[PDB]
């Protein structure tokens with residue numbers, strides 16, 4: 643627990659077509675999503691809640707590849723480069739809904755847990771409904787930015803508390819979320835379903851910092867140079883050969899970049915999302 647993996651990078655083993663699709667599904671959460679029958683790649687938009695002001699927009703889709711896909715917006719309801727003394731960045735226990743499912747000493751960042759907790763009843767209800775409606779057993783969770791950390795928590799909660807568990811999770815520009823205990827519990831419960839994707843010089847995976855007790859789960863795929871198709875996998879937790887070997891840029895350019903031919907441009911990107919356009 644709390645280590646840094648020193649093993650070498652390996653070729654990217656992920657399904658780049660699924661990553662490209664997932665990227666589209668989350669870009670679309672930055673756009674109004676109540677137009678009926680909207681199609682993003684292989685997927686149909688079924689349902690939306692939130693709006694990216696009080697709560698992150700969450701879209702529910704049906705995909706033949708990904709099943710019932712839950713996509714969580716990550717717009718700046720709070721900012722991740724602001725004063726780290728703020729209560730948003732404090733570690734806290736798991737919420738009483740699911741603390742029983744986690745190891746003792748698990749800690750999560752208040753800001754992400756709060757924001758997930760405001761959506762979690764509605765996510766569960768809509769997922770359960772559209773699984774029944776579409777006779778679909780697979781649940782895919784997708785997030786970007788703030789919504790990537792919320793989405794990791796959602797992914798876990800689905801695996802622990804929902805019938806059928808989780809299929810896959812695809813997370814883009816994932817901030818840190820929990821402590822070493824949480825991150826090792828992610829590896830152990832959803833490690834084989836976990837896909838963290840980082841683009842270029844993106845700074846967001848470096849916050850909140852490890853000196854405040856935060857730790858990523860094992861493995862990410864890092865696209866370098868930013869926006870290209872050149873990418874490797876950096877295995878284990880907090881790989882020393884990964885992203886800190888190249889200087890972070892302190893803007894959202896690469897964060898809101900091209901991930902396997904699909905842009906996640908955020909609020910000022912493409913609406914509707916266009917899978918495989920770039």
Ligand SMILES: *[C@@H]1O[C@H](CO)[C@@H](O[C@@H]2O[C@H](CO)[C@@H](O[C@@H]3O[C@H](CO[C@H]4O[C@H](CO)[C@@H](O)[C@H](O)[C@@H]4O)[C@@H](O)[C@H](O)[C@@H]3O)[C@H](O)[C@H]2NC(C)=O)[C@H](O)[C@H]1NC(C)=O
Nearest residue numbers: 842867868869894895896898899900905906907908910911
């Ligand atoms: C990888 O792909 C990314 C696109 O998905 C690239 O990100 C883009 O990078 C450029 C410059 O590096 C950014 O352009 C800047 O935009 C600011 C925004 O403020 C202005 O917003 C409106 C937009 O129309 C404008 O009219 C006003 O003047 C505002 O002031 C400008 O102020 C700057 O001059 C600057 O040009 C893009 O915004 C950014 N796109 C996104 C979606 O974030 C990235 O650079 C690519 N990386 C590599 C390595 O190739």
Ligand SMILES: *[C@H]1O[C@H](CO)[C@@H](O)[C@H](O)[C@@H]1O
Nearest residue numbers: 645646647648649650882
């Ligand atoms: C990186 O290097 C360390 C030794 O310094 C090992 O513990 C690890 O297996 C990896 O080779």
